[PDB]
Amino acid sequence: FNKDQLEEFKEAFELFDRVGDGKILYSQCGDVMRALGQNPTNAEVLKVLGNPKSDELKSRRVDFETFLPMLQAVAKYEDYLEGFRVFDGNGKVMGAELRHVLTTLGEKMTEEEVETVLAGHEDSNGCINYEAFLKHILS
Amino acid sequence: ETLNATTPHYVRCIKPNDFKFPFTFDEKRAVQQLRACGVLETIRISAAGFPSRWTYQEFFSRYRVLMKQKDVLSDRKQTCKNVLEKLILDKDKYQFGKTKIFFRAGQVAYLEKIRADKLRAACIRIQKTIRGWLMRKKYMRMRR
Amino acid sequence: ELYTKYARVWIPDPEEVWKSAELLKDYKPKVLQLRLEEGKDLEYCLDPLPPLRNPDILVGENDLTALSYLHEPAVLHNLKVRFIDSKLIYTYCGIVLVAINPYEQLPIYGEDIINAYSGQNMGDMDPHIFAVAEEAYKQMARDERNQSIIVSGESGAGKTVSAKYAMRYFATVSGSAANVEEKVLASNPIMESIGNAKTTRNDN
Amino acid sequence: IGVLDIYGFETFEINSFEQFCINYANEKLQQQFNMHVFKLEQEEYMKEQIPWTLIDFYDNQPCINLIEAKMG
């Protein structure tokens, strides 16, 4: 990232800086990466963070300059489609099944995150057009 | 010579606990009872064969998760022959009967593991993408 | 090999013949890191492997041969779970029927269930003594050849209860009035008085 | 239709002629059971058109010959 990129990213970082010291928490580093359009795993975030311990993960703070190499390291469709097609072959996916698997397998999310992103995107049968929802969430 | 004139059907009774407690099951007693009834050496003999026998359609239902939408044919038997011959490279682990797939002991667990591993990798990829989308939107809220 | 992270394994234990464990780090060609229910790591060593565990979908199935790993702890687990949590006293192994004596009376012997089994094929149902009796009763009609039910175990296990219900089944599906059930049951006290003993390890 | 009620295999701390007889009877019955299962498996394999040579037969006759045969 160049100075222009660093300035836009720093402004975003400061928006996520909730203490005013120019720093975020380890637990916010992933949040910042996600805020910039990336979809990193929890594992990649923890790896670039240096596998922090619970105590420093929840209370040790790092500024943007330490975050930047980590964002870089993390940074460095048909499979995504097949991943959604696992739970289908009429081009649909049950909302209940996607909700269950996203909240119980893998890097489990909360029911509220899934309800929020899924609100208004599933139809009356409780079916999700996964190609359209996926394109929407990837934009 | 009385039983050989006849067609057998077998029952085994096991005693779960020495104290006649209702619906309690002492593993140390029950293992001994199962050995004494020959059930365990029966199972050891069965495990040498093809224990696990699956109908083509229920197999296809279970393992389409592992199957590319290209590769499923109209012909179930040929579809499964293809898929299984890729998924389990040693052909000696299964036989294609007229009506059922026969598996050796262990291989249906292998197929279930590789299915679960595919399903997990897909779920991780999708859900991490949804997490990064949602927090990207929370960033747009904070910019607003 | 496929001893991977989050592979479950069985480990031998003095107190309950096998305990479940989970392989806490991948195996690679001497000692395994095992996570136990009792404590997050206690460690197990490999000799000049632990029995791998069946996947969770398979455990609890009606027929022990449906398991993919066939061995003492998986059998013991399936019988234990089916008995304790589902109160199903009957299970299949190959042809054999395994009857786990509950020491408790049960509604499962009722005449409605006798009707429910009559005319079924063997695999169509969860296992029950009536399904063996029915398989015999159909083969006796389809063919001249005679049929036997063989009951084996210790005498405490309750073989007499199995035979009692197998006769009740025969009587009911025959539609018979006759009177064999009462007499055969009333024969048991003399046959036990003459032919029956107290051993070092069992009474009667 | 016959209902045969019989004792299982038997083993004690101190072990004697009564058990030797019981275990011989249980060897004979287990041979019959292996006969029957093997036969029904050859039938099921010919139902599914699978070559018979894949099913191996496990045989306890070397143990029965140790007991009941001449010089046993």
Author numbering:
A (entry chain B): 4 to 79, 86 to 97, 100 to 150
B (entry chain A): 649 to 792
C (entry chain A): 5 to 33, 36 to 54, 59 to 187, 190 to 216
D (entry chain A): 433 to 504
Publication text:
By using the actin cytoskeleton as tracks, myosin also powers cellular cargo transport processes and can serve as a molecular anchor and force sensor. The myosin motor domain consists of four subdomains: the actin-binding upper and lower 50 kDa (U50 and L50) domains, which are separated by the central actin-binding cleft, the N-terminal domain, and the converter domain, containing the long α-helical extension known as the lever arm. The active site of myosin is located at the interface of the U50 domain and the N-terminal domain and is allosterically coupled to both the actin-binding interface and the lever arm. This coupling ultimately enables the amplification of small rearrangements at the active site to large, force-producing conformational changes of the lever arm.
The structure of the actomyosin-V complex in the absence of any nucleotide in myosin represents the rigor state. In addition to an unoccupied and open active site, the actin-binding cleft is closed, facilitating strong binding to F-actin, and the lever arm adopts a post-powerstroke orientation. By applying a mask including only the central three actin and two myosin molecules (central 3er/2er), the refinement was subsequently focused on the central section of the filament (central 3er/2er maps, resolutions stated). The remarkable similarity suggests that the same set of interactions is maintained during all strongly bound states of the myosin motor cycle, despite their varying F-actin-binding affinities. The actomyosin-V interface comprises six structural elements, namely the cardiomyopathy (CM) loop (aa 376–392), loop 4 (aa 338–354), the helix-loop-helix (HLH) motif (505–531), the activation loop (aa 501–504), loop 3 (aa 532–546), and loop 2 (aa 594–635). In summary, we demonstrated that myosin-V establishes a maximum of contacts with F-actin, utilizing all six potential binding elements. Notably, our data show no significant change of the helical symmetry parameters upon myosin binding, neither in rigor nor in any other state of myosin. In contrast to previous reports, our results elucidate that myosin-V hardly alters the structure of aged F-actin-PHD.
